[PDB]
Amino acid sequence: TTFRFCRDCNNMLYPREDKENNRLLFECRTCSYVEEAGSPLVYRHELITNIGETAGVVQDIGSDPTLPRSDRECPKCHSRENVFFQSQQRRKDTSMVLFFVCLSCSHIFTSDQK
Amino acid sequence: DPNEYNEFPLRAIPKEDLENMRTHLLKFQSKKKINPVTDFHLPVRLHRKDTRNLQFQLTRAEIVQRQKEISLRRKTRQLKVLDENAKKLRFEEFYPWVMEDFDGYNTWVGSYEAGNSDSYVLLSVEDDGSFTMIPADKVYKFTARNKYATLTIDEAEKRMDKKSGEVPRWLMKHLDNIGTTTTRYDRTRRKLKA
Amino acid sequence: LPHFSKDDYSPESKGFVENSYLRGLTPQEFFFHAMGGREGLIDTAVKTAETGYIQR
Amino acid sequence: SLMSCISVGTDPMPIITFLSEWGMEPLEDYVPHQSPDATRVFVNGVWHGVHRNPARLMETLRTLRRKGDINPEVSMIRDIREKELKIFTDAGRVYRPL
Amino acid sequence: EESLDLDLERSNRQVWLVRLPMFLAEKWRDRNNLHGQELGKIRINKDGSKITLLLNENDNDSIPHEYDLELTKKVVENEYVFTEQNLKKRDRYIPYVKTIPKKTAIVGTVCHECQVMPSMNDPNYHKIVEQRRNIPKKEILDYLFKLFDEYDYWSLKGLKERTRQPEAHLKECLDKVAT
Amino acid sequence: FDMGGYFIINGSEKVLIAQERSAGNIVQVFKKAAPSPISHVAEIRSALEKGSRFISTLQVKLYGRSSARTIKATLPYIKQDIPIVIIFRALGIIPDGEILEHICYDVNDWQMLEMLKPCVEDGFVIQDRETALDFIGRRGTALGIKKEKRIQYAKDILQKEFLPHITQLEGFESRKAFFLGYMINRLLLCALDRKDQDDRDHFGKKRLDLAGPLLAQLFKTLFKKLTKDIFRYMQRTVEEAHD
Amino acid sequence: SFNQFVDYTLQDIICEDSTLILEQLAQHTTESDNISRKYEISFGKIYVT
Amino acid sequence: EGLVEYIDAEEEESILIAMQPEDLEPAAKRIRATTFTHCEIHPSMILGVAASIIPFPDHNQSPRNTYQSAMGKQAMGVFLTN
Ligand SMILES: [Zn+2]
Ligand SMILES: [Zn+2]
């Protein structure tokens, strides 16, 4: 569902149809460059979204003070230090999931109990 | 450090040559490397022209072929003051820099950016190893233009007016197949053939 | 309030004044008490004008 | 409140030059791909460019304003969660000592 | 007089671009400077990747002498530096838009950009930081006849400057014969 | 004991009182109500200390709750809101991938790019900067030697009045473009529900005006009145003398 | 706030708009020719008592 | 020399404050994190001029404080000495 731009001039290729061989010609509209696409999927909606709970993992989260600290272990490095915080995707509908990130292994892991 | 490099500290420019020259900076906007001294249909005439209706402008080859074929007062006012350098800059960049090939196959239009032209300074090694010392003055960014037979204002307005739920997907290709609004290179080719 | 780490829901952080008027309030609890009282005052100051109009 | 105080503003232009000199990319050659994660820098709202390693600047500016070489009404924030860095030097802010 | 085309043979030249600290830019953009002298020395590794600037003592120690020249960009593309010195002296194309294309000349391309940074260990270095913190009825009758013969729409103001006479005497003469 | 910062007017001790206002020159988003055709808007106030009061209000508006998915941006003195691709071309960005690089930053995410596809389709009309600059925004005054609009006039608008912080001089269009893209990204984050609605009663987004700024307002107004009056009596001393 | 407004901000608000010029060359043709009568008024440093 | 800091209303979204200078500083009266960057000077200096006169203001109801802070400006005493 991503956009492929015309390499010859940076504009996204548009879906247009072979009138006889029946192929997906992503053609440029700016210039005349044409491209054959890979899959018959073109448009895509996703009427229900449920993603974004682990947002903004920067490489140096531990430099902030205001994040709390705990004593669970990273199940890659088993260091007893770690940082946890609430899910990032602030909807009225989200959960109490805690995402633990450890400074040692720089690795994220949750505590789901399904 | 041992002489594993051309250790030539700077030899400054001729001061007498410094006057009556200004050495700006050229910048291109494309992901592919461009060398105009190879790609371009030389001669190259970098001019400062107005760009009003450059689709209907001049091809150099077409111009050569056409030449060959032909041959009360208010008494009261107030100047709200403005800086002389700024006003001169407005006057100079009232037209931008344009360079083309002889064919008009590929054109590039410059414009002025005022970021950090002062802080930049040039150092070129010469053929003898002379390291020349030029304080750069201005930088210009150039974008290619009308490489793909751009449309025009009025039929553009009829396209963007809310008469259709969506404009035609291949409308520009249909107009090209009709034949209207050709490229500058195509106009030059037609003038050369006729 | 800027005296706690992020993402708490323990009642003292979000405003349970556990203490009592005899012992006095820790300053955070004092602030939350001020919040509740202010809410009451502004509600009175609007309801009086509207109820007067609608009595007339 | 009793220790409250009011900012009176200070010219940003030494901070701007200083902050350029300690490593920025001015916006005119910024490109998103080659710096996919570097940090935006704002001064009174105006963006001035992007910088690679933010923490060194952040602590450096702290040390500089603690040494007294920047008028201590100046306030800086490194919002680590969004790769932001703000400098404020306008008048009319409210501040209290700590 | 000369040709109308630009120069091309100096395309294949290496040019290096330097971002410069502003004091050093002011020292190096002086007309009383720029005389071919060599005020410093450069130092690249055999492996590259680090340059200090060995500035000579011509600066007289107000500014440092040890400058960590940091190569900002190793490889640079699509960059061409050009000069412009002044020149010796549907088919209705406008021939003259008063474009005055002077002697334009390429002088090379850019592969590297580097930034000059003074090394903080120098006493003049970081001293600059606190410095930045610190900062006649019958005669006129015939004469009138020539005058309107010169110009039939002769105005009163043009008449007055052509007479320099008493105006009431002037006005009573004019209407007696013509307008 | 009379440590007092007050004034004596006609022999009565008068005092100023600090006013406040929202912080200038700072980004706010909003969620206007459902029955309006607009769902999310962004605002920028501005100032420049403080010639002719420098209001210069800007919006970026969104439409629909689908198919009305469009981003019209208002602007003085342009009487209609404009889809933003026109503005990007007007500042001088032609190719759409680089408009997208101005807007979004992570090329991996896409939801913003499907969210922006209709505005790109709006931008299919115009493929050149002055052919975007031409668009109307009449709102006075009388047009000079024009055909429809001076391209010079429109670019003079975008240079002098538009967004009267980051610059005002002549040559900082790329800065204006990045600023606009940042604004769009903030609006789009708010409407895409990754980032919450802004607040107005956070204290830091307010400033306290006080005696100096208030005196600055009165002094600027009075001195501009004064300059107008001294410009009078100097042109109309056609007769003697230079008093 | 007051001290800031007196020490600075006042000289600034003057010097930002000091110039006012009516330099008269001829403002019509001739006048033969005439010369550029610079009637200029500008403000400098200010004073406070 | 870096002992106190001026903090505006925003860096509190970036810092962490301690009440007492002992509250977490070493690792029948009243009921009363290891990354502190600042400690406040004294918690009683969140008050204002009028409310700094109420004795034991932490030991009553807040609206009563608001009344008293209103009424105190209507009191009489001396006001100056000249
Ligand atoms: Zn193409
Ligand atoms: Zn681990």
- Domains of chain A with CATH codes: 1-45 (2.20.25.10), 46-114 (2.20.25.10)
Cβ contact C–F (≥3 pairs, < 8 Å) = no
- We report the CATH number of the domain holding residue F94 as 3.90.1110.10
How remote is the CA of residue F85 from the centroid of ligand 2, in Å? 46
Whether C37 sits inside 8 A of H46 (CB atoms) is: no
* Residue F40 vs residues B140, F123, F190: alpha-carbon distances, Å: 38, 21, 8
Between chain H and chain E, are at least 3 CB pairs below 8 A?
no
Whether the Cβ atoms of residue G6 and residue G48 lie closer than 8 Å to each other = yes
Q: Is C39 on the interface with H (CB under 8 A)?
A: no
Q: Which ligand is nearest to the CA of A7?
A: 1
Question: Taking CB atoms and an 8 Å cutoff, what residues of chain B touch D26?
Answer: 115-116
Angle between helices F96-103 and F84-91 in degrees, nearest 10:
100
Closest ligand relative to A109 C-alpha: 2
> What end-to-end distance do the CA atoms of chain A give, in Å?
32
Is the Cβ of H7 closer than 8 Å to some Cβ of chain C?
A: no
For residue A80, the tally of other CB atoms under 10 A from its CB is: 12
Closest to B57 in 3D by CA, of B98, B29, B93: B98
Q: Domain range for residue F113?
A: 25-199
Consult the annotation and say whether A107 binds a ligand: no
R_g over Cα of chain C: 17
DSSP-assigned letter for residue B36: H
Q: Would strands B11-12 and E51-55 be described as parallel, antiparallel, or unpaired?
A: unpaired
CA A15 to ligand 1 centroid distance, Å: 13
Asked if A9's CB is within 8 angstroms of B147's CB, the reply is: yes
CA F44 from chain centre, in angstroms, equals 6
CATH code of the domain occupying D9-90: 3.90.1070.20
Q: What is the least distance, in Å, from the CA of C11 to any CA of chain H?
A: 14
* Tokens coding B16: 């007498």
Nearest CA to E16 out of E42, E54, E46, E55 is that of E42
Tell me whether residue A26 is annotated as binding. Answer: no
Ligand 2 centre to CA of A105 (Å) is 5
Contact in structure between E10 and E80 (CB atoms under 8 Å): no
Residues 6+ apart with CB under 8 A from B44: B36, B99, B100, B101, B102, E5, E6, E8
Q: Touching check for F195 and chain A: CB below 8 Å?
A: yes
Which ranges of E15-154 does DSSP label H, i.e. alpha helix?
22-27, 127-134, 137-150
- D neighbour chains, 3+ CB pairs within 8 Å: A, B, E, F, G, H
The resolution of the experimental structure, rounded to one decimal in Å, is 3.7
Pairing of strands F27-31, F38-44: antiparallel
What the block records as the tokens of F66 is 């689908």
Respond yes or no on whether the N-terminal peptide bond of residue F148 is cis (omega within 30° of 0).
no
F204 — contact with chain H (CB < 8 Å)?
yes
DSSP secondary structure of F47-60: -SS-GGG----EEE
Rounded to a whole number of angstroms, the distance from the CA of G5 to the nearest CA of chain D is 10
| Cα distance between residue H23 and residue F21, in whole Å | 37
Chains G and A: 3 or more CB pairs within 8 Å of each other: no
Whole-angstrom CA distances from E4 to B17, B58, F75 are 20, 16, 44
Q: How far is the C-alpha of B8 from the C-alpha of B128, rounded, in Å?
A: 10
Q: A105 labelled as ligand-binding?
A: yes
* D39-43 and D86-88 strand pairing: parallel
CA distance F151 to F89: 13
Distance A106 CA to ligand 2 centre (A): 7
CB F29 within 8 A of CB F194: no
Q: Does D44 touch chain H (CB under 8 A)?
A: no
* Cis before H34? omega within 30: no
Flag whether A62 is marked binding.
no
Number of Cβ atoms within 10 Å of the Cβ of B14: 11
Distance from Cα H16 to the centre of ligand 2, integer Å: 27
F185, F189, F192, F197 alpha-carbon torsion, rounded to 10°: -140
Q: For residues B47 and E100, give the distance between their C-alpha atoms in angstroms, rounded to a whole number.
A: 7
